[PDB]
């Protein structure tokens, strides 16, 4: 009951000549795959672990100033000299202070002054990098059966976890009773970890863009330092004051942790405390059903009473789940299940948990089906004690069409060109659409990188207005389309 | 400040919720609105300047919006 | 892996809070429920909590007299019983289950805490 | 709505005894059944779950028997140590809360 | 004048990209007939087309445990390095960033 | 982890003796294996480099063996000279460092 | 062609620097690694460096405790050990190896510097 009730669940239907289908797995989503004569399976990317990180840079968020010293030079006599100014561990600045007989100098005028203080780091945020070949994606594959899922969450016989790494392009999962499943996932194109940094500040971590991380205006260490005392730009974390031009002072600016939390607004939080593992991103996989057979097809059928132990529950995805218990003999058998009209002339809806069987006859079976819009009747068992449970599905096929179109648009806005690989068979139209999407997305991401959703909306409005007031009818249509897409992306961004 | 360069338009956001997505979605709009409320005088000047550099009510409104947005953002 | 609060003594018409520590792993992955054993008597189910969600459910016996809460900062689950009396004298247990609507196998049981209600 | 269990049971070493736990359809026969043994002064232990499954570490002598609306528990290879109070735990849809049987204090003639 | 290895190769050093557009991979051989040709191809996902050329022409295994590092020029898209034969074949994914 | 190696080795003059060094998939079987002879009060000497290739210094009687995940050093003819501590060093990809074995003190009988 | 520093007797809690002077050919063509052998114990690898490139890498056990550096002007390699303690007592060796990332064949060695952590 995990892929049922995630609310980010996609039904990929059918395979291609070859028995393979293309699915993109996201961390917060689920993929349930249905093919004719094939068992329904639930796919879930549940972990992405980055191994063997290398620190790219170390930033200073909280510093302290000690050993402050100053030196002065009388006017016209050049610059003051501080011995500390030879130690890069000291932050220094030069200024001018008016001098004279009163200030202990000789001639009158602006005498140079240099103040120095030992910069020390109290708290730092470490940015780490990983090679794409050191990523490990954990994918759970559970056969969509009514079997009791597991003794507990810790160890589940029902679910089969496979680890996907760039080292092997093929991963096999032995689903007991169903054959084997072949996952051929592309870990090199889900996230580009050559442009990404793993930034941990203080028991919190984020997945940030590498250039953004290197453009941060904070003091930093090279990451190969090992000494931790030679910071590159310490002036960003101190302020020198000469208010009246008669005294130079230096103070430390204060902890930059809240400022860094503000700066991290658009990043995705990850876990780096133990293991350096994160839960964001997708994984394009080619699922091969060549060696997936149904389970318990040699069982005959159940000739006995079925009782509903949990009332029919409507799922977030237009599907109903029925929990039934078997009371008859011949314990391992196939549950007679169908969704028909009132007169039972026609089959109206399809079963999601294909080939349902009762194994022990004491353990109930959660059957999931997709009933039709309107009135349907779930017929369970044979006529001697046959169950007939009415159901009404509140919706329409046009509403489902609109919702699916919106879901696909959102997926395209999230996965970009990878959206064409989702549930895709190796069709010509899908390939050409993906090529066009790649080109258009390259142009769009060149034109809109580093802008906020409000800027996106303003630009979309401007472009759509320009298209509306365009002499060319083709230019008008093209500009209006670009503006509408830009407005949609601005609305659907920052998530 | 580091907070003046948010990790906003990097093109890395997934379907997972980002750090301060919901909170920071409308913060810029709120800041601009409060600044325009506290400094109406600059708003009238911006409107007059936009109307002067016009030739089109689209240009007038665009210039007015850009000036009003930049004025608080510039610091 | 579950630590419950030490032996306590109370008085009639009082409120007692019973605390159970967790392992952190069983705090956001399992559920916790409270069972009371009267002196020389059988087990009794009072209520349950799923710490990450926190919406507790209570037996009709104790509905309105008990309040179960979980401290997510300290991974602790608390049982508070108000309006105590002689009957409420019993040892109190907390155990964890799979947090599924159908799963109630209490594999890990708290060592228990004795609550005594007496006029003096 | 309340699980009914025999107050006590007796046996001899190597001679298994069966403990019955009967309830309504909503109580038992529609939900899993769990069996616990409670030694005096100690927390109850989970003997079997899902009406016949023994958690790892439970000796195979324990059997989980379930019926249409009643359940039974038996202890093969009875020993002196098995003497304890045995409870059947099962969520009952009616009463919307887990319910326990009256308990069974198994008696073994060790003295 | 050698026959294909018909054995199991293992990648002892992950695929490393050079700054010339090619890739170099270090593979050991655990098989019989030590001086044999290495069955190296760079195909697509379905192994229906040959997409790249290995610029280490005719890689061979002189000794069983001695590692050999092949250099190949994959295509600019997504490509797969196939090393070995049906039993224990290695399929290595790779992505080239240019155009 | 580290290359496990036999602490105790015994042989007799004129007899061929070999030392076994077993590593992991990242210690041995994925990287060259080097064998070193370290007499008391002297620095270690490189016995066989690459995968059991003799440097010019070591006589032909010295040789080594390499397998899927283990290595061995072969001694053609034996003497009291082979009474020393023996180490198998190999780069570990996971450990990211040259990890020797535990050290094998070879004892040559004849005293 | 590789000459190490003389014997050094230190005290607990201090830091010790060891000098290994290589020739010109070995400085510009080979790497140099630091292996310390504890009294009555097996060889251990501390770290190494390509003197011409100078980027030093250390065993995971010695992160933050060993510093290895080269003096291209005098063609010398130094190992500095911080937090000297009782277990840090051992003989230290500098060996010459190729700068490839696959071959660690030490065809040259020094003579070992006895860093005796004791009082004599
Ligand atoms: C900084 O001042 C402290 C004060 O005692 C002194 O111990 C320390 O040596 C000073 N540091 C430098 C670099 O002069």
TrEMBL record, chain B:
It is found in: Host endoplasmic reticulum membrane; Host nucleus; Secreted; Virion membrane. Residues 2-74 form the Envelope glycoprotein M flavivirus domain. The chain crosses the membrane at residues 44-67. Homodimer; in the endoplasmic reticulum and Golgi. Interacts with protein prM. Interacts with non-structural protein 1. Forms heterodimers with envelope protein E in the endoplasmic reticulum and Golgi. This is Genome polyprotein. It comes from Dengue virus type 2.
TrEMBL record, chain E:
It is found in: Host endoplasmic reticulum membrane; Virion membrane. It comes from the Viruses. Residues 1-96 form the Glycoprotein E immunoglobulin-like domain. Homodimer; in the endoplasmic reticulum and Golgi. Interacts with protein prM. Interacts with non-structural protein 1. This is Genome polyprotein. The chain holds residues 298 to 396 of 495 of the full protein.
